[PDB]
Design a protein around this ligand. Structure first.
Ligand SMILES: [Cl-]
Ligand SMILES: [Cl-]
Ligand SMILES: [Cl-]
Ligand SMILES: [Cl-]
Ligand SMILES: [Cl-]
Ligand SMILES: [Cl-]
Ligand SMILES: [Cl-]
Ligand SMILES: [Mg+2]
Ligand SMILES: [Mg+2]
Ligand SMILES: [Mg+2]
Ligand SMILES: [Mg+2]
Ligand SMILES: [Mg+2]
Ligand SMILES: [Mg+2]
Ligand SMILES: [Mg+2]
Ligand SMILES: [Mg+2]
Ligand SMILES: [Mg+2]
Ligand SMILES: [Mg+2]
Ligand code: NA
Ligand code: NA
Ligand code: NA
Ligand code: NA
Ligand code: NA
Ligand code: NA
Ligand code: NA
Ligand code: NA
Ligand code: NA
Ligand SMILES: [Sr+2]
Ligand SMILES: [Sr+2]
Ligand SMILES: [Sr+2]
Ligand SMILES: [Sr+2]
Ligand SMILES: [Sr+2]
Ligand SMILES: [Sr+2]
Ligand SMILES: [Sr+2]
Ligand SMILES: [Sr+2]
Ligand SMILES: [Sr+2]
Lengths: 142, 142, 150
RNA sequence: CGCUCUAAUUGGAUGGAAGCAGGGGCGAGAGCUCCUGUGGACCGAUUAGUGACGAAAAUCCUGGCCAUAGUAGCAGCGAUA
RNA sequence: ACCCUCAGAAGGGAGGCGAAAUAGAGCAUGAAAUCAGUUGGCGAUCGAGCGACAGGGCAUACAAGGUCCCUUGACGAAUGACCGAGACGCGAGUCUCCAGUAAGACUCACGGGAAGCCGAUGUUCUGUCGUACGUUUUGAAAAACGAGCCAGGGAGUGUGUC
């Protein structure tokens, strides 16, 4: 009648008071777009970041309004860097044997796109039984 | 035509720029101001030099135009505009909610704002806006 | 060539197309724009009046240098593109024909969709002065038409 | 960080590979990854190598395309048809 | 194929084949520039490096993000009072006490609420800052040089010796 996701979709990880604080910080502070200078001015200039090299470049010179230059001071906290917005650390899975050694309390799973529907069915049931959430579940008709 | 003014100001024997500065501040604060008796409004100084400045503004112009009002109606309105950011959205709304008048079209007598009145018994070197307009060539209709 | 850019329910609709027509694309946009919404029969009477010179086609986008016409309402510049109108009459002859064969009242049907697409150019070359040659091309136009039951 | 091909180790794909379009997540970032659609047969990862390995520019090269514009020309000539 | 249309071996429509005709003839895929139609946002009183960062309007099928708002309460850095009491100053105003107190960013807990709702994306409005880029140059927005736009192509290589 309706569509429902396979697995433990609502599962949340158990993070320490510090890791939960830092995750909430990352989410609040955020970061600038960091797109290439004048990407919007020319279609041939892509959004991808390149260091402003021009001796007169307004962005290189740090002129306010011309965008933030990439620096190390923009890095996210070590304790939380790379975590999914849920708080989970991602583990890329290709087969059933890749689900072994995974802690479903702290790590969630993301099945590779290249993996077919047949192998996905076997991974998704063996993930639910092992207490691991799949970030990209199959939506079956129930 | 009817104009629902919150504040009705009496310009009679009052220093134009000082009234204008306050009428501007009020218009930006969302007040609907109406300046009354502007023919009788005052501007201090040597008449001969005051008239020169205003006569020059009338002589200034080209094909693009420099429309300068000769009537006291418009002179006071232009003085208020110079104290407002009339080109911006917020500033235009403020300006359009301010109207200057010849005489008093209302029943109510206007209020005299603080620091604006000039003691005629203490001053000899001043001019009335109507006197400026008569010299500029405007048709006396007050 | 093109394909129909809009969906059409076969039960309440009639389709028609023109392929690689050597006529002005700029004139075709103007005609399509003006006949849209009109009844198939209204469109035929309109285009015949254009060919005759009694009704101007409003040129809203491709109007540079075009003189104003009094009969144009809401706008100023217009012309009488007879070649492109004669081609649109063939499109409406085909559509109303396909419509009648299906059991509909062809003439009474509304023009739900009509759009022209520049499908290419038939290339030509014109010899200029100083031993040089420049392009002298002909536009190749496709136009789709979807007649709908009122 | 990314690209090519080699090798070892190890994976994915017609229960839908690469590519492309739109969209979600991560990384300060080079960039990584997922979802949907399209596509319809290939594609990775790690390690050690290989290099015809990264473009916004050079009056750069080739191709394609827009505005210019339904504009100029389709008159001028002692042969005005 | 057949049928209809047409001046018509054209083209079109209907139809047939095939997993697929958006595989139908320079016919795998089918990007950008760009064009037609159309959707969303803005729009005929208003100002121009086209944006970055903040914050509002309107817009949003699913999926791949799930947060967000308000009462109250806990914690509470730097900073930090009003009122009042007393005491000065020609005066604007100030000192002492109340008090490092109330307050104070973030974060959290209970209760209540939102699912176009939070993020995010499109567009537009407001604030702040802002005259491209690369090169030449002491000094470039430059009335110094280069490019119409897009795609693809386009520059430290080999041998020998040190
Ligand atoms: Cl680092
Ligand atoms: Cl003038
Ligand atoms: Cl202004
Ligand atoms: Cl005096
Ligand atoms: Cl054209
Ligand atoms: Cl915190
Ligand atoms: Cl080098
Ligand atoms: Mg771009
Ligand atoms: Mg003309
Ligand atoms: Mg020659
Ligand atoms: Mg290995
Ligand atoms: Mg390249
Ligand atoms: Mg360069
Ligand atoms: Mg012209
Ligand atoms: Mg003759
Ligand atoms: Mg093809
Ligand atoms: Mg010099
Ligand atoms: Na004065
Ligand atoms: Na003047
Ligand atoms: Na008209
Ligand atoms: Na008219
Ligand atoms: Na917005
Ligand atoms: Na140069
Ligand atoms: Na420059
Ligand atoms: Na200059
Ligand atoms: Na050109
Ligand atoms: Sr896939
Ligand atoms: Sr135009
Ligand atoms: Sr397309
Ligand atoms: Sr190269
Ligand atoms: Sr080629
Ligand atoms: Sr052209
Ligand atoms: Sr002739
Ligand atoms: Sr067919
Ligand atoms: Sr405290």
């Amino acid at each position: 009648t309706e569509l429902q996701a396979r697995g433990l979709t609502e599962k949340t990880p158990d993070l320490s008071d510090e890791d939960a604080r830092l995750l909430t910080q990352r989410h609040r502070v955020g970061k600038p777009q960091f797109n290439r200078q004048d990407h919007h001015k020319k279609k041939r200039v892509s959004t991808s970041w390149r260091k402003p090299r021009g001796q007169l470049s307004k962005q290189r010179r740090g002129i306010k309004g011309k965008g933030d230059t990439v620096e190390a001071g923009f890095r996210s906290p070590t304790a939380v860097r790379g975590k999914h917005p849920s708080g989970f650390e991602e583990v890329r899975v290709h087969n059933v044997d890749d689900l072994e050694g995974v802690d479903g309390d702290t790590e969630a799973v993301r099945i590779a796109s290249k993996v077919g529907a047949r192998k996905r069915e076997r991974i998704e049931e063996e993930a639910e039984d092992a207490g691991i959430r799949v970030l990209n579940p199959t939506y079956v008709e129930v | 035509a009817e104009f629902d003014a919150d504040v009705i100001v009496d310009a009679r024997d009052c220093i134009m720029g000082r009234v204008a500065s306050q009428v501007a501040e009020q218009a930006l604060d969302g007040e609907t101001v109406a300046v009354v008796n502007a023919e009788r409004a005052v501007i201090t100084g040597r008449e001969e030099q005051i008239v020169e400045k205003y006569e020059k503004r009338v002589d200034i112009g080209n094909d693009n135009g420099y429309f300068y009002p000769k009537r006291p109606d418009g002179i006071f309105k232009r003085t208020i505009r110079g104290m407002l950011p009339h080109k911006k959205q917020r500033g235009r709304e403020a300006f359009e909610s301010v109207r200057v008048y010849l005489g008093n079209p209302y029943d109510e007598d206007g209020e005299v704002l603080d620091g604006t009145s000039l003691d005629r018994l203490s001053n000899i070197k001043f001019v009335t806006l109507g006197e400026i307009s008569e010299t500029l060539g405007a048709n006396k209709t007050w | 060539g093109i394909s129909y850019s809009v969906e059409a329910d076969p039960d309440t609709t009639a389709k028609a197309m023109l392929r690689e027509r050597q006529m002005s694309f700029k004139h075709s946009k103007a005609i399509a724009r003006e006949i849209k919404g009109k009844t198939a029969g209204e469109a035929v009477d309109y285009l015949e009046a254009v060919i005759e010179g009694d009704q101007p086609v409003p040129f809203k986008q491709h109007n540079s240098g075009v003189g104003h016409k009094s009969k144009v309402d809401g706008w100023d510049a217009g012309r009488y593109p007879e070649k492109a109108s004669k081609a649109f009459l063939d499109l409406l002859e085909n559509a109303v024909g396909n419509a009648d064969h299906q059991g509909f009242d062809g003439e009474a049907m509304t023009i739900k969709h009509v759009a022209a697409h520049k499908v290419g150019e038939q290339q030509g070359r014109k010899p200029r002065a100083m031993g040089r040659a420049s392009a002298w091309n002909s536009p190749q136009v496709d136009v789709e038409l979807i007649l709908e039951e009122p």
